[PDB]
C-alpha cells in the first residue's frame with residue numbers, strides 16, 4: 095500500500111484539490127488542538143451557513159464516514175450533497191469525544207470524560223457514518239455543507255468513501271441458526287450447541303443489542319453477519335462502559351466471527367473489562383471483516399496462538415487495538431485498519447513458554463493514534479512486521495521497539511530477528527513523560543522519534559529495520575536509547591534502505607541524557623542506504639557523546 099488494502103478511500107478535507115469557503119487550519123503537532131489532532135494535522139472549519147468543503151470521488155461510493163469535531167456534549171447534523179443536490183444528513187456527535195487531563199497528567203488520557211476545574215480537553219474528533227441510496231461514480235462532487243438547522247460549527251477532517259455491496263443473506267438457514275426479532279443471539283447459540291448439524295449462527299442486517307458477554311463453547315462456532323455496514327451489534331447506548339461482546343472458551347477454539355460491526359458504549363478507558371472479544375489462550379480462531387468502535391480494545395491475547403485477525407476495522411477505542419501477549423505465537427494479524435486507538439494500535443508484548451514467536455503483523459494501517467504508538471513490539475523472537483502505514487501519533491513513536499519489562503517476567507528480545515520490513519510513517523512521534531535534568535532539552539517532556547529503539551532492563555538484540563520511509567516526523571526519524579544503569583548492550587541492530595525526510599530536529603538521535611540519572615546508549619547499530627533529507631538542525635545528534643555506542647556506516651548514507 096503501504097498498509098492495509100481496504101475498500102474505503104480516505105480523503106483529507108484540507109486537500110488543495112477540494113474547493114472550500116471555510117477555514118483551513120494551519121498544521122501543528124499539538125494534542126488537545128483541532129489541527130494537532132486531525133488526520134494530516136489539518137481540517138476545514140465550517141462556521142457559517144453555506145460554508146462547505148467539496149470532495150471529488152476517486153472511486154465509486156454509496157457510503158461515507160465523516161471524521162469531524164463538534165462542540166462538547168452536543169449532537170446535530172451536517173449536510174451531504176452530490177453534484178450540488180442535497181442527499182442527506184450526517185448524524186454528528188461528541189458523545190464519545192473530549193477526554194480530559196492536564197499537560198502534566200497525560201498518563202490520564204482516555205480515562206476521564208468529564209470536564210472539570212483545571213482540566214484540558216483532548217481526543218476531540220469523532221466519526222459519523224452514512225449510507226446513501228445510490229452508488230455515485232468516481233468524479234462525483236461530494237460536498238459537506240453547513241445548512242440552516244445544522245450544527246453551529248464543525249471541523250471536517252477527512253471523508254471515507256466506500257462502495258458497499260448489498261447485504262449478504264444467511265449462507266444456509268439449515269446450517270446457521272438465524273438471530274431474529276424474537277430469537278436472541280444467546281438463544282440461537284443454544285440451538286446451535288444442541289444440534290450438531292449446525293455450523294453456527296447468522297446475525298441479519300439490523301441493530302441488535304449486546305448487553306452481555308456472549309460465551310462460545312461446546313465446539314468451534316461460526317458467527318456470520320450480513321457485512322459490517324449492515325449487521326450492527328450495539329451496546330446499550332443509554333448506558334456507558336458496559337463490558338459486552340464475545341468470550342471464547344477453549345471448547346470453541348477454531349471459531350470464526352465475521353462480517354459484522356460492533357458499536358460499544360465506552361466513554362473512557364477501563365483496565366480489564368472492555369475488550370470486544372475475550373479469548374484467553376484461544377487457538378485457531380478467525381476474526382475477519384468486522385468493524386468495532388468504542389470498546390477498550392478489539393482483542394488482548396494472553397498465550398493465544400495460531401489465530402487470524404484479517405480485514406478488520408478498529409476505530410475510536412480507549413486502549414490498544416490488538417495486543418498479543420504472554421506467549422502468543424504464530425498469529426496472523428493481516429490487512430487490518432486502525433484509526434483513533436487509545437493506546438498502542440497493534441502491539442506484541444512478549445513475556446514468559448519463553449517468547450512470543452512466529453507472529454506475522456502484515457499489511458497494517460494505524461493512524462490518529464490518540465496515545466502511545468502506531469506499532470509496538472516489546473521483546474519476542476522471530477516476529478515479522480511487514481508493509482505498515484502509521485501516521486499522526488499524538489504522544490509517542492510510529493514504531494516502539496522496546497526491551498523494557500514493565501515489571502513483568504520477560505527475557506526481552508530473543509535469538510531470532512524481530513523484523514520491520516516496509517513501512518511508511520507520516521508525522522509520527524510526540525511528547526510524553528518528563529525531562530527533568532535532560533540533555534537536548536526543548537520542553538518539559540521527553541521527545542519521541544518516528545522509530546524508538548529502547549534498550550530497557552532486558553536483552554535488546556536481533557532487530558532488523560528495512561525499507562522504511564519516515565516523512566515529516568515530529569522530531570526525529572530514528573531514536574536510540576539505553577536505560578541506565580542496566581546499560582544493556584544492543585546487538586545485531588541493523589537499519590537498511592530508510593529515508594528520513596524533513597525531521598524538525600535530527601534524522602537520527604542517540605539519546606545522551608533523557609532525564610536526571612540517565613546516560614547514553616550501549617552497543618551499536620549498522621546503517622545501509624539511510625538518507626537524511628533536510629533536517630531542521632543536523633542529520634545525527636549524540637554520536638560524539640555516546641562513546642559506547644558504535645554507529646556503523648556500511649554504505650549509502652548521506653550523513
Ligand SMILES: [Ca+2]
Pocket residue numbers: 106107108132133134135136137250251252
Ligand atoms: Ca485532515
